[PDB]
Design a protein around this ligand. Structure first.
Ligand SMILES: CC(C)[C@H](NC(=O)c1cccn1C(=O)[C@H](NC(=O)OCc1ccccc1)C(c1ccccc1)c1ccccc1)B(O)O
Lengths: 27, 251, 10
């Protein structure tokens, strides 16, 4: 619903230190 | 987790710790998928070769944690189990096929900045993200090596899904469609794997389409930890979703 | 190595 959206990251539009590594692997 | 890094505060707010009442110890990892359902590996609860057959009253669920051993007053929530549901075709006798179970909490947990449910993939999510090379994220409070000891806080590591023929050829165990494997190859130089105590935790991926975290896998099994030419095997959550839905719908 | 939890959860 609101599932998979972190209160301290996505919800505040802040990125964790390694989530980009994931994104960069999704080609 | 071997060769991981300390998790950031609220980095994995669906992370659940399966904790044994007496003696007080970590039993496995798990994940929060709603305010009253927790997902973990069947082998965390039931594993006849090692005489494991936990019932509801043997355990507690700790949600919102970061430190392994502290009682995280005002941050964690600690819940009792009303009921445990193991996949009826979980295969403990041979390869841990269908290694999945659900735990219904006695009371709904409150969500907070540190507690929040992860999404379960649908067919398209799985189709689009479960590809060789695509990286997922594994978290847990397990051993730092096969043989420092145990971490002080929740550990994290990102690992690439591996081609199914390479998974096959890395082991003597019979691989099924309800499993996938992840980890770097020897030539990739980078390391990382789940280890003793990490079982039952989540292998998640962040959809680049709707920017949500989905739990694609459950830490199931591996031969040692972070060994060259070996990979971690994970329960394919999407393939067992019908069972998940059936249990939750009925119960 | 585990700190006691409110022994009410137990
Ligand atoms: C963190 C997770 C991944 C770990 N999972 C579990 O340890 C899992 C629960 C029951 C045996 N299991 C395992 O991961 C086993 N690993 C195993 O026991 O690794 C140690 C080992 C190293 C070298 C030789 C033998 C063993 C694994 C397996 C898969 C499916 C069914 C039964 C056993 C296996 C054994 C022998 C050869 C190849 C694979 B943890 O230790 O519980």
């Amino acid at each position: 619903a609101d599932c998979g959206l972190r209160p301290l990251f996505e919800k505040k539009s802040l990125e964790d230190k390694t989530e980009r590594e994931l994104l960069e692997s999704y080609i | 987790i071997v060769e991981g890094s300390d998790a950031e505060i609220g980095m994995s707010p669906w992370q659940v710790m399966l904790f044994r009442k007496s003696p007080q110890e970590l039993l496995c990892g798990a994940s929060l998928i709603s305010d009253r359902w927790v997902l973990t590996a069947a082998h965390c609860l039931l594993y006849p070769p090692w005489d494991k057959n936990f019932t509801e009253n043997d355990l507690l669920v700790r949600i919102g944690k970061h430190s392994r051993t502290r009682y995280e007053r005002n941050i964690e929530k600690i819940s009792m189990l009303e009921k445990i549901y193991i996949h009826p075709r979980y295969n403990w006798r041979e390869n841990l096929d269908r290694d999945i179970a659900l735990m219904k909490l006695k009371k709904p947990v409150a969500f907070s900045d540190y507690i929040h449910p992860v999404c379960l993939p649908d067919r398209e999510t799985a189709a689009s993200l479960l590809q060789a090379g695509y990286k997922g994220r594994v978290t847990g409070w397990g051993n730092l090596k096969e043989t420092k000891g145990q971490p002080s806080v929740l550990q994290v590591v990102n690992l690439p899904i591996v081609e199914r023929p390479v998974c096959k050829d890395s082991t003597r165990i019979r691989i099924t469609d309800n499993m996938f494997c992840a980890g770097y190859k020897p030539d990739e130089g980078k390391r990382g794997d789940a280890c003793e105590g990490d079982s039952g935790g989540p292998f998640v991926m962040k959809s680049p389409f709707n920017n949500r975290w989905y739990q694609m896998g459950i830490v199931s099994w591996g031969e040692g930890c972070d060994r060259d030419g070996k990979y971690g095997f994970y329960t394919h959550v999407f393939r067992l979703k019908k069972w998940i839905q059936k249990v939750i719908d009925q119960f | 190595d585990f700190e006691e939890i409110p022994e009410e959860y137990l």
